[PDB]
Amino acid sequence: MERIPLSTEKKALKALRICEQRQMTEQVRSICKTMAMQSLCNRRLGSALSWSIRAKDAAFATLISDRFLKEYCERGNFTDLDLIDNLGSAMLLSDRLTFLGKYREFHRM
Amino acid sequence: MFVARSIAADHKDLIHDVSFDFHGRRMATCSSDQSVKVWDKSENGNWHCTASWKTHSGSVWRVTWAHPEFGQVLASCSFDRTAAVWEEIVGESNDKLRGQSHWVKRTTLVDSRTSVTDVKFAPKHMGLMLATCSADGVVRIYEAPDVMNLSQWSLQHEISCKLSCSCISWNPSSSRAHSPMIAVGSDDSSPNIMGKVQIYEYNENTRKYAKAETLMSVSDPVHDIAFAPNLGRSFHILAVATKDVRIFTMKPLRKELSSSGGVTKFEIHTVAQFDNHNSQVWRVSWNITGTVLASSGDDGTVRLWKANYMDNWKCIGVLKGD
Amino acid sequence: KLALTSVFEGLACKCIRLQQGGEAAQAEAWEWLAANQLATVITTKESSATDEAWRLMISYLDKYEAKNTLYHHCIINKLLSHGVPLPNWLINRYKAMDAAELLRLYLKYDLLEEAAELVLEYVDALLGKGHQYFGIQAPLSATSQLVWFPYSAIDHLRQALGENESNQHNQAILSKLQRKMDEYFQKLKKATDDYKKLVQKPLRA
Amino acid sequence: MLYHEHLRRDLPNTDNIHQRHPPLRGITQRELDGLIACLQLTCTIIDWSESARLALCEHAQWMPVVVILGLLQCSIPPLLKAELLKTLAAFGKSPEIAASLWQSLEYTQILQTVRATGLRQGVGIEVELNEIESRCEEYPLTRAFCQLISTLVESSFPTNLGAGLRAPGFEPYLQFLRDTVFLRYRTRAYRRAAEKWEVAEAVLDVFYKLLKDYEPQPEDFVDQYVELQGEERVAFKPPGFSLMHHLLNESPMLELCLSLMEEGVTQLDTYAPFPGKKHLEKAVAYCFMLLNLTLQKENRFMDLLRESHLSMIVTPLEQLLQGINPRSKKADNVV
């Protein structure tokens, strides 16, 4: 399952469904980290963050969150506003993500 | 019928190693010409050189891919006493530099005093770790503490083998019941030195690798070593390339609760010894399931070995280049 | 513009009380730890309040470097006054800064074994083994700068190890130390003779 | 520390049986009363303040645990040793210190846990109890040792106790408390009639604590083998298993508990005040609490024993209570 080439998000989601049906949590985490890293390398921070949240990887979430913050400092605005607005309980995954979410709430207000 | 396919590697000198990526869609080659090349498999099954660069100031002995969870990372090691880590930057280099430029040297590991003979990434569940072995008789284990910053690599462990190191293998077992293990081979030609394969186990209490075992039956120079992938076996399998192909099983003896800090003792059996190369064996590689061994030697052949249901190992195929 | 010494002594005292304290002291510690800017509290379910108190101490030592080893000295002298074993990270940092002051601190608190291991490692560092761990730029050579050897503190260690004739362990340490001192004095004599030979080749340039 | 260093220089090397040396420069009575007062003040401060307990124990220059344990190995008066053990007990109330004190007690061999084949003259608390305290008819050291063990059992129970020196476990301490202290307490002379009951209370408190927290596990009914010096030895069973085994059989321990309940009710039926009444009442209460804990755990212990391959037979406590009392020659224990 870990060796399947994940060329598309659809293929990744299918593989995940199969892993989840069979309670393979390590593989789910691994596949999500791979997709998160791939998305990150392709400068798609929103997708990277989404996959990181699914991986329940606090360290990785903190990292992606720092990149959002750095981008803000450089550009003055966030590229993926919709995802950050709908983080819900996922905001508690990391302190940095929580900050990012609350910071956005500040701008909304 | 296995079909041999020639790939014009366009290396200016001898190729020492070939390493596939985790998906088997890319390969890296390294040479005496001081270069590493990367090759991509197209949909038609053809191989194309997508990158080629000088990495070292001497012959490049080994090349290895990291696990894809850490991104597109290569390590190379050399006669120049260094190991180098390279990252592929996947990004829109404007459509005019498709030739050479997307691989960035992130670090050069320079702690080795002589030739760095082999380099292997650790199993992903241990993090982004890189082992190097040198002919100075030392294995060095580095860790990248931040996957987003591959320029920083901390030396975590130094293992004195007291023999010239030629090859290394991580035990890929993800079982928490097994401490992390490394096998180290030696190419020392001295006939008075018995035990040219040494097994080191990470001891949590000492936070150090300790010598667990020495394969005293291996007295001949060791050219390559490979732990087999452990898909639910209660024992390890180690292949050793020397004057012959050797396969060892290593069954951990239950720690009697009385040795409050000992290395795991192993019940070790030679389950196969194959002289069919009639010559030195240079490489050994397991399939992803740890059930089929490939070996190469001076006979110009690649041989495939498999156990039957009675644990009897046999040669199941011979591949020869034209 | 006040001295930060009282802050480092008090933080060291809270770290000691936390390490000696039961579950109640660990619960109270989260309240005062949260009141200080740890710029990176990732609440991983695996860090004790004691580990975060030591991370805070490391972060303050990194942010507030004194020109003189005063803050490291003050923390070590406080830990030793409470009989607490020194953390390896603090020993390794202070070995790189002032190994001679560390040896005097171990002697002041009768830690003869750790003092002897420090002298053995410092002598090995001067001989060229592990010189990087002691901040020694160049090992003992004919052309290297003279590293100050704390001979009086090592002689006090030899005296303190020698006053206890009944302890076969102290004699084994003292004989190991003497043999290493002799190896050092032989290499020093050779390096001094090779320096004399470098000085005695006539200026024909 | 100065007393530890001076008293240790005078320990005779084993090779000179021939010359009358002049009398030991013993601690003077005023210095003794001073040391006792300092230890009692120290005990009282660390008994109430956990922050003082940790800060004193971790003090790198004073090394109080090492100095105190080193003084217990010297030939000092039993009253000073008893106060030193109470100071260790007061330090052992914090779980961090208690774990280190268990390792230090095994290293110092204050109780002989390792029997070497050839020394017929034991050094330690068992000889001080049998030769010194028994002659004085006063047992302050034995009570202070029971108090130290009672406090250490409550703060930390180490499973690997004595690992590498002997078979791991608490059994040597249990044997001393059971066979040397409890089973013999009645046969001893006592200058103070109340101290007979103070010794019984102090040992029964340890047994009650050891049985209170013990739950029968399937692992307790399997012989675990541990390699020691190239021989396989059976590991020691948990102390609560040993207590259940003695309380659920016709053992001298069960007989002594039942006869202590008989002696208790016979003294109470006098309706008169007597010395050590409060301590006899508590010692009887711990005997009741032990039997009650046994009855509560009995069904689970017997079911696991029946599922095990151990050749051990155990009798329901309720049937043993119908046994003939050896004193009355009647089945009067339930009465």
UniProtKB/Swiss-Prot annotation, chain A:
It is found in: Nucleus, Nuclear pore complex; Nucleus membrane. Signal peptide: none annotated. Belongs to the nucleoporin Nup85 family. Component of the nuclear pore complex (NPC) that seems to be required for NPC assembly and maintenance. Involved in nephrogenesis. Component of the nuclear pore complex (NPC). This is Nuclear pore complex protein Nup85. The lineage of its organism: Eukaryota, Metazoa, Chordata, Craniata, Vertebrata. The chain holds residues 437 to 545 of 653 of the full protein.
From Swiss-Prot, chain B:
The keyword Transport applies. It is found in: Chromosome, Centromere, Kinetochore; Nucleus, Nuclear pore complex; Lysosome membrane. It comes from the Eukaryota. Keywords: Cell cycle, Cell division, Centromere, Chromosome, Chromosome partition, Kinetochore, Lysosome, Membrane, Mitosis, mRNA transport, Nuclear pore complex, Nucleus, Protein transport, Repeat, Translocation, Transport, WD repeat. WD repeats lie at residues 10-49, 55-96, 111-152, 160-210, 217-258, 276-315. GO terms for biological process: attachment of mitotic spindle microtubules to kinetochore; cell division; cellular response to amino acid starvation; cellular response to nutrient levels; mitotic metaphase chromosome alignment; mRNA transport; nuclear pore organization; positive regulation of TORC1 signaling. PROSITE patterns: WD_REPEATS_2, WD_REPEATS_REGION. GO terms for cellular component: cytosol; GATOR2 complex; kinetochore; lysosomal membrane; nuclear pore outer ring; Seh1-associated complex. Pfam families: WD40 (PF00400). InterPro entries: G-protein_beta_WD-40_rep, Sec13/Seh1_fam, WD40/YVTN_repeat-like_dom_sf, WD40_repeat_dom_sf, WD40_rpt. The GATOR2 complex is negatively regulated by the upstream amino acid sensors CASTOR1 and SESN2, which sequester the GATOR2 complex in absence of amino acids. In the presence of abundant amino acids, GATOR2 is released from CASTOR1 and SESN2 and activated. The keyword Repeat applies. GO terms for molecular function: structural molecule activity. Component of the Nup107-160 subcomplex of the nuclear pore complex (NPC). The Nup107-160 subcomplex is required for the assembly of a functional NPC. The Nup107-160 subcomplex is also required for normal kinetochore microtubule attachment, mitotic progression and chromosome segregation. This subunit plays a role in recruitment of the Nup107-160 subcomplex to the kinetochore. As a component of the GATOR2 complex, functions as an activator of the amino acid-sensing branch of the mTORC1 signaling pathway. The GATOR2 complex indirectly activates mTORC1 through the inhibition of the GATOR1 subcomplex. GATOR2 probably acts as an E3 ubiquitin-protein ligase toward GATOR1. In the presence of abundant amino acids, the GATOR2 complex mediates ubiquitination of the NPRL2 core component of the GATOR1 complex, leading to GATOR1 inactivation. In the absence of amino acids, GATOR2 is inhibited, activating the GATOR1 complex. Belongs to the WD repeat SEC13 family. This is Nucleoporin SEH1-A. It comes from Xenopus laevis. The lineage of its organism: Eukaryota, Metazoa, Chordata, Craniata, Vertebrata. The gene is seh1l-a.
